């Protein structure tokens with residue numbers, strides 16, 4: 001189960017990772033047997049910002 | 050989840066992902082109806098010494 005505990009927090013970012021407490025609710029718990037041992041994000045947007 | 054209790058309406062709010070609902074113990078103080086997705090309020094039947 002690839003759990004994705006996502007909280008799209010509707011708060012401001014006066015500063016990054018601000019203080020306070022924000023619990024994360026799982027959104028998708030993907031059942032898949034896989035060995036992730038790396039990672040990378042994408043900005044593939046054509047008009048990459 | 051098999052047990053004995055007094056099923057009743059619950060004012061508790063089970064966040065979407067929240068299936069069952071124990072309390073400060075281990076007792077399923079609440080269940081979400083498989084169907085109708087309703088938050089019940091399972092409570093033990095009124096026993097007591099005589």
Ligand SMILES: *[C@@H]1O[C@H](CO)[C@@H](O)[C@H](O)[C@H]1NC(C)=O
Pocket residue numbers: 034035036037
């Ligand atoms: C998954 O990949 C890593 C990196 O190659 C490897 O060390 C690991 O043994 C793999 N996991 C499994 C399923 O054996």
